[PDB]
Symmetry: C3
Subunit: 88 residues, 3 copies
């Protein structure tokens, strides 16, 4: 789970790109990790609310999962744009 | 909806394009995370318990900083672009 | 709904960790403005530290929700805070890595 992201970081450290590109490649996947952690925190909050009050939290989990997906899409796009301009 | 507006009018060099798009997409991400927190706080039945207005303020603040960051990003880049 | 400016001030007043990170952000932004770097590099130096503030605000929002329930420890409450704190940590690590790579490539 943190392997897949750290693996990308290693690749981004190996690719013959300039410093700016490397930062963008690395930061985009670290953002995915950040949003995944925040989403899992929200999921824990939802579960905590359910445990305490026996109440659902509406679309809280769906909204958090959508945040992760967008972060992932942002990462794919970033990598595509950069690594296609770098060579295509 | 005005995000996809920003994206298509960003579509300049590749690196700059990534920065313009990403700054706006970060706003989307943060807004979704803020909306998730809101869905918990304002859930059905929340009126019967202790309610964290603080949580919603903090989440809205995160959106504000994301937006401000996006403005600073576009301003610096576009000022570099023209003039 | 939430009040953003009210929220910013509340985070500052109530969270010592937010003030600590906030002053670090201000220092970095001032340095970023002072440094002789191109626009792209400047944007990255600034956005990377600003992300810490964004994530800390979200983390603090998460914390406020579970704390509102009660003071007594619950495993799910601890889990939520740990995950939120890990997110902030990764944002900070990312910021330092960004600064290290960009500054060293430009000036090293
Ligand atoms: C000094 C600002 C730090 C720079 C980073 C960007 C913004 C992050 C946080 C700013 C909100 C702080 C506002 C609250 C404040 O300082 O009021 C004064 C308070 O300390 C005394 O009662
Ligand atoms: C270039 C700066 C000069 C002008 C300063 C104007 C701003 C005045 C007050 C701003 C807020 C002070 C923040 C200090 C603070 O709370 O730090 C403590 C924190 O790091 C420890 O937990
Ligand atoms: C809290 C401040 C700590 C500063 C430590 C000492 C740093 C001295 C020089 C910085 C490294 C080289 C950067 C060069 C540079 O961008 O110059 C700035 C610009 O104003 C000149 O054209
Ligand atoms: C190419 C890599 C360059 C890296 C430069 C050296 C990095 C050394 C330390 C990195 C971590 C920075 C500080 C992280 C930290 O302790 O966070 C503080 C805590 O408040 C987090 O929640
Ligand atoms: Na990032
Ligand atoms: Na940005
Ligand atoms: Zn706290």
């Amino acid at each position: 789970e943190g392997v897949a992201v750290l693996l990308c970081v290693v690749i981004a450290a190996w690719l013959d790109v300039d410093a700016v590109t490397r930062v963008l490649l690395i930061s985009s996947v670290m953002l995915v990790m950040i949003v995944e952690l925040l989403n899992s925190a929200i999921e824990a909050v939802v579960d905590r609310i359910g445990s305490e009050y026996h109440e659902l939290s509406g679309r809280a989990k769906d909204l958090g999962s959508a945040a992760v997906l967008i972060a992932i899409i942002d990462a794919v796009i970033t990598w595509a744009i950069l690594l296609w301009s770098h060579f295509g």
